[PDB]
Design a protein around this ligand. Structure first.
Ligand SMILES: O=C(O)c1cccc2c3c(n(Cc4ccccc4C(F)(F)F)c12)CCCC3
Length: 131
């Protein structure tokens, strides 16, 4: 996938604190992550997609191949098993840990990058626009 290629800036966010709460993020990290306004910078070299999120709070980065499970340390220090695929133009990213799982979908919508984060019954939506 490449229509995702570019530098993206968070412009709106709903339910992110609830989402983080359900995932199990401690209060102190929620407070600083919630206020954060990260850049998500996505690139692709052949079959390796790289995604970087930068903020004063924390920078993270993952590089992966569609369909191949990899170990991820998250911004909230969970050690998860991640598997990201491309489904009908949507990048679906799944993280598995302690028998729990959360799904993060990234999709292009007009000129936005829309991110839907789901944990159990909570759904958070985050909108990023080209910088
Ligand atoms: O950037 C995001 O929008 C984002 C999207 C999906 C899940 C998460 C999680 C987090 N964030 C925010 C994030 C990710 C990576 C780096 C920086 C941040 C920041 F700054 F908190 F927004 C997410 C924080 C840890 C809980 C899981």
């Amino acid at each position: 996938c490449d229509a995702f290629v570019g530098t993206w800036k968070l412009v709106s966010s709903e339910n992110f604190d609830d989402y983080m709460k359900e995932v199990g993020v401690g209060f102190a990290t929620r407070k600083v992550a919630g206020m954060a306004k990260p850049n998500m910078i996505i690139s692709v070299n052949g079959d390796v997609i790289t995604i970087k999120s930068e903020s004063t709070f924390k920078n993270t980065e993952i590089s992966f191949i569609l369909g191949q499970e990899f170990d991820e340390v998250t911004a909230d220090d969970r050690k998860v098993k991640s598997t990201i695929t491309l489904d009908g133009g949507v990048l679906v990213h799944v993280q598995k840990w302690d028998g729990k799982s959360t799904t993060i979908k990234r999709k292009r919508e007009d000129d936005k990058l829309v991110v839907e984060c789901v944990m159990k019954g909570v759904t958070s939506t985050r909108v990023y626009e080209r910088a």
